[PDB]
Design an enzyme around this catalytic site. Structure first.
Site, PDB file in Angstrom:
ATOM      1  N   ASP A  59     -15.141  21.694  -1.519  1.00  0.00           N
ATOM      2  CA  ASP A  59     -14.208  21.221  -2.554  1.00  0.00           C
ATOM      3  C   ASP A  59     -13.869  22.276  -3.620  1.00  0.00           C
ATOM      4  OD1 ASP A  59     -12.572  19.661  -4.173  1.00  0.00           O
ATOM      5  OD2 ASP A  59     -14.229  18.637  -5.155  1.00  0.00           O
ATOM      6  N   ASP A 103      -6.640  22.588  -4.046  1.00  0.00           N
ATOM      7  CA  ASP A 103      -7.694  21.564  -3.994  1.00  0.00           C
ATOM      8  C   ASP A 103      -7.994  21.086  -2.570  1.00  0.00           C
ATOM      9  OD1 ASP A 103      -9.438  19.377  -4.410  1.00  0.00           O
ATOM     10  OD2 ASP A 103      -8.287  18.587  -6.089  1.00  0.00           O
TER      11      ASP A 103
HETATM   12  C1  LIG Z   1     -11.155  15.655   1.352  1.00  0.00           C
HETATM   13  C2  LIG Z   1     -10.163  14.499   1.247  1.00  0.00           C
HETATM   14  C3  LIG Z   1     -10.752  13.168   1.731  1.00  0.00           C
HETATM   15  C4  LIG Z   1      -9.852  11.980   1.350  1.00  0.00           C
HETATM   16  N1  LIG Z   1      -9.844  11.673  -0.089  1.00  0.00           N
HETATM   17  C5  LIG Z   1     -11.045  10.986  -0.578  1.00  0.00           C
HETATM   18  C6  LIG Z   1      -8.835  11.994  -0.916  1.00  0.00           C
HETATM   19  O1  LIG Z   1      -7.735  12.297  -0.460  1.00  0.00           O
HETATM   20  N2  LIG Z   1      -8.868  12.120  -2.256  1.00  0.00           N
HETATM   21  C7  LIG Z   1      -9.784  12.884  -2.881  1.00  0.00           C
HETATM   22  C8  LIG Z   1      -9.526  12.856  -4.235  1.00  0.00           C
HETATM   23  C9  LIG Z   1     -10.343  13.572  -5.250  1.00  0.00           C
HETATM   24  O2  LIG Z   1     -10.423  13.074  -6.475  1.00  0.00           O
HETATM   25  N3  LIG Z   1     -10.933  14.651  -4.842  1.00  0.00           N
HETATM   26  C10 LIG Z   1     -12.016  15.370  -5.538  1.00  0.00           C
HETATM   27  C11 LIG Z   1     -13.224  15.564  -4.598  1.00  0.00           C
HETATM   28  C12 LIG Z   1     -13.613  14.271  -3.904  1.00  0.00           C
HETATM   29  C13 LIG Z   1     -13.663  14.277  -2.511  1.00  0.00           C
HETATM   30  C14 LIG Z   1     -14.011  13.103  -1.830  1.00  0.00           C
HETATM   31  F1  LIG Z   1     -14.070  13.076  -0.496  1.00  0.00           F
HETATM   32  C15 LIG Z   1     -14.309  11.919  -2.508  1.00  0.00           C
HETATM   33  C16 LIG Z   1     -14.255  11.921  -3.895  1.00  0.00           C
HETATM   34  F2  LIG Z   1     -14.536  10.786  -4.547  1.00  0.00           F
HETATM   35  C17 LIG Z   1     -13.907  13.081  -4.584  1.00  0.00           C
HETATM   36  C18 LIG Z   1     -11.516  16.695  -6.147  1.00  0.00           C
HETATM   37  O3  LIG Z   1     -12.625  17.349  -6.780  1.00  0.00           O
HETATM   38  C19 LIG Z   1     -10.420  16.397  -7.174  1.00  0.00           C
HETATM   39  N4  LIG Z   1      -9.995  17.600  -7.935  1.00  0.00           N
HETATM   40  C20 LIG Z   1      -9.483  17.342  -9.320  1.00  0.00           C
HETATM   41  C21 LIG Z   1     -10.450  16.590 -10.222  1.00  0.00           C
HETATM   42  C22 LIG Z   1     -10.082  15.366 -10.801  1.00  0.00           C
HETATM   43  C23 LIG Z   1     -10.956  14.646 -11.627  1.00  0.00           C
HETATM   44  C24 LIG Z   1     -12.219  15.215 -11.845  1.00  0.00           C
HETATM   45  C25 LIG Z   1     -12.600  16.429 -11.271  1.00  0.00           C
HETATM   46  O4  LIG Z   1     -13.754  17.088 -11.380  1.00  0.00           O
HETATM   47  C26 LIG Z   1     -15.003  16.358 -11.419  1.00  0.00           C
HETATM   48  C27 LIG Z   1     -11.712  17.130 -10.453  1.00  0.00           C
HETATM   49  C28 LIG Z   1      -8.394  12.043  -4.378  1.00  0.00           C
HETATM   50  C29 LIG Z   1      -7.662  11.642  -5.503  1.00  0.00           C
HETATM   51  C30 LIG Z   1      -6.552  10.805  -5.321  1.00  0.00           C
HETATM   52  C31 LIG Z   1      -5.825  10.412  -6.486  1.00  0.00           C
HETATM   53  N5  LIG Z   1      -5.095  10.207  -7.342  1.00  0.00           N
HETATM   54  C32 LIG Z   1      -6.138  10.359  -4.074  1.00  0.00           C
HETATM   55  C33 LIG Z   1      -6.858  10.751  -2.952  1.00  0.00           C
HETATM   56  C34 LIG Z   1      -7.973  11.578  -3.121  1.00  0.00           C
END
Ligand SMILES: CCCCN(C)C(=O)n1cc(C(=O)N[C@@H](Cc2cc(F)cc(F)c2)[C@H](O)CNCc2cccc(OC)c2)c2cc(C#N)ccc21
Ligand SMILES: CCCCN(C)C(=O)n1cc(C(=O)N[C@@H](Cc2cc(F)cc(F)c2)[C@H](O)CNCc2cccc(OC)c2)c2cc(C#N)ccc21
EC number: 3.4.23.46
Lengths: 387, 387
Positions: free
Chosen positions: B34, B230
């Site tokens: 990530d 990201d």
């Molecule tokens: C590898 C993809 C697998 C499928 N998933 C779960 C996703 O598509 N998503 C992952 C997100 C997300 O929020 N990702 C995290 C990581 C994550 C992966 C996962 F696996 C399950 C999760 F809980 C989270 C990143 O880090 C965000 N960066 C900015 C940020 C935004 C807010 C706080 C931050 O830092 C702590 C960083 C995310 C956000 C939205 C919105 N609006 C919609 C879809 C999203």
């Protein structure tokens, strides 16, 4: 082939021409380069639009063939008297050939006011020569009588802006390399499509895209009833069904601005404030051509900078104005001067093929250029030819 | 870096993960890669979606920081207990790092069933680490404690079609090259954009095109309130105004075929008869990024093969089905996994820049490919940054 580089003058709207001499002593004449026909003909009597003409009585080498000739093109026509004379190209190969010449005595809508040319060089094959195929075309005579290789190549250079009479006389309009290929005239690779039949320079289009989107017509529609490369005509000319599909698709791609029906009909200009022509809203057009290797094709890609022809304003204001240089055809597909301006086109008569490469003088912007790209594995290409 | 090639598994919808070991003796865990966060965290108690988890009581090298931590991402979240332990990457550099680890004890919508990962590796900077920037991120620890260069690069490889559970387990998902660049992972040149600020991997988008057509927005709109790279998010996510314009333009470009609103909202599938997906009707999207040279930009171009995400057809038919992988964002522009799948991305922390090259594993067709192209003369580009 340095001596032949920059030997052309003119523009897509009025034609590209080469300097020639006929007779003894040499009479200098400007001659339209026409890959769309096969007769060599020159004005031989006064006309309102001619500043000079061929004077047979002044040539000691003139031979009278005692035969009339009539050549009707799609819209224009002329009538003349057949003979032969010695012919040279001052900025061509260092040779003199005896060639058939049609001395034009009557014409209707043939000569063009201010074009600076007085004759036509039909560069296609004997089959479409008038009165019939026994009248050997100039290029055939040239090859037969000399050691000049059986090929020529053309770089037609559009300016990208309008040229007045003064500018067009002083501007380099491109290059006709007789007997070879000059590498300074193109970038990238040359891609070859077979000449289907030696009459016109007939080719086969196997696929058409507007901004990558397939028109998805039966490919026979693209070549109905033929597809030709024609420097003697301004526009990309497309069969009815293809024209309608292409225009609908171009309109939809460019729909962020609206244009009158007359623009799309090729008849009226559209103007933009100096420098603000929105090129990006207009799509690219790709024509896929049959390759030399079985089951292969390549594509040539043109920009709106090619299919929008610069024209002078009715006002003659600082505006940048254009006409839509795509027209519905009564004669099949025609790759006219505006298409040829994008490319270095090699008419390899010896190997019965036509080469395309991106022109070193094509008009483009910082974001997009013309392209020649391949190969593509293509569907059932031979079937695209119309019978 | 041959040892690190092909060390990733996964897919855009569920995440790409790397094998790691934590503690003594080593506990093997699969960890989500990530670039969008800065906390290293692992499941540390049983959970329905976890087949294994970190057992602190079984690690002789575990250190308890006696401190809780709470990390809310946009939709998902977890809480846990802070500590440190020894960490290695079996298919990474040959080193052992003492790193901060959050032992996840409670979570909501964080773990993903069938993803095959048990933790998260936040590779971004200390500025966005929780509880605050004093919690040193894993990569910082790695560089400080070893001779590993301050750089990593990612090649995420989407299949271009659905993979079942056993298929995703047995397939190579891509490469994380820690401490370097592998030339077999890309074609063409690497183009670099500056990291605007070291928190997220923040970049500046200066121009957006849909099939060459300029979206024509104030460039601040593209970066409102930030633009980040990201890998921990599936979609290309766009600020409200940019999203609306993009979807309108993509609907306009693909108008020959109409789809329900729920598709464009990224919620519902669209399916086509096996093999008949009409890629050509969908436009390419070009994102122009600020160059390293003043007044210079380059562009990355993605295909519909990138922004349409393959999903299984669970019905009896053999249809090819996809979701629209572009979403409206509340958090600025997000270049998620589907974008990254088009490119080999170099996180050159040492030189505060991000490199892009066409990926050797990007999905395309025989007509179009993803591209990384430049330079373009562009002006007042620091003005495109939001403040
Ligand atoms: C590898 C993809 C697998 C499928 N998933 C779960 C996703 O598509 N998503 C992952 C997100 C997300 O929020 N990702 C995290 C990581 C994550 C992966 C996962 F696996 C399950 C999760 F809980 C989270 C990143 O880090 C965000 N960066 C900015 C940020 C935004 C807010 C706080 C931050 O830092 C702590 C960083 C995310 C956000 C939205 C919105 N609006 C919609 C879809 C999203
Ligand atoms: C770069 C030219 C300057 C501007 N002009 C005059 C033109 O755009 N055009 C030239 C045409 C034309 O018909 N061209 C002749 C040459 C010509 C140039 C010119 F200068 C003035 C003319 F009389 C004629 C080609 O040769 C045709 N090849 C196929 C063919 C069609 C019919 C008979 C043929 O062989 C004899 C060949 C032509 C045809 C249509 C139609 N339909 C519309 C516009 C046309």
């Amino acid at each position: 082939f340095v001596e032949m580089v920059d030997n052309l003058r003119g523009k897509s709207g009025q034609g590209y021409y080469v300097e020639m001499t006929v007779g003894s002593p040499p009479q200098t004449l400007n001659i339209l380069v026409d890959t769309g026909s096969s007769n060599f003909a020159v004005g031989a009597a006064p006309h309102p639009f001619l500043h000079r003409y061929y004077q047979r009585q002044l040539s000691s080498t003139y031979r009278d063939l005692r035969k009339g000739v009539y050549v009707p093109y799609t819209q224009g026509k002329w009538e003349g008297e057949l003979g032969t004379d010695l012919v040279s190209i001052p900025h061509g190969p260092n040779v003199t050939v005896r060639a058939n010449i049609a001395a034009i005595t009557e014409s209707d809508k043939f000569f063009i006011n201010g074009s600076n040319w007085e004759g036509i060089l039909g560069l296609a094959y004997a089959e479409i020569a008038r009165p019939d195929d026994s009248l050997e075309p100039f290029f055939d005579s040239l090859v037969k009588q000399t050691h000049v290789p059986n090929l020529f190549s053309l770089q037609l250079c559009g300016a990208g802006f309008p040229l007045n009479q003064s500018e067009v006389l002083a501007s380099v309009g491109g290059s006709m390399i007789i007997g070879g290929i000059d590498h300074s005239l193109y970038t990238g690779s040359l891609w070859y499509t077979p000449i289907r039949r030696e009459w016109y320079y007939e080719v086969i289009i196997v696929r058409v895209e507007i901004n990558g989107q397939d028109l998805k017509m039966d490919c026979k529609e693209y070549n109905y009833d033929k597809s030709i490369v024609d420097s003697g005509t301004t526009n990309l000319r497309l069969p009815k069904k293809v024209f309608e599909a292409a225009v609908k698709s171009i309109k939809a791609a460019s729909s962020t601005e609206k244009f009158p029906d007359g623009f799309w009909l090729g008849e009226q200009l559209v103007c933009w404030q100096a420098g603000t022509t929105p090129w990006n809203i207009f799509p690219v057009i790709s024509l896929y051509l049959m390759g030399e290797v079985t089951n292969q094709s390549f594509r040539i890609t043109i920009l709106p900078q090619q299919y929008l022809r610069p024209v002078e304003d009715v006002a003659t204001s600082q505006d940048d104005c254009y006409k839509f240089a795509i027209s519905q055809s009564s004669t099949g597909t025609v790759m006219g001067a505006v298409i040829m301006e994008g490319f270095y086109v090699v008419f390899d008569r010896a190997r019965k093929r036509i080469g395309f490469a991106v022109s070193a003088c094509h008009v483009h912007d910082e974001f997009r250029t013309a392209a020649v790209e391949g190969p593509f594995v293509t569907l059932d290409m031979e079937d695209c030819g119309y019978n």
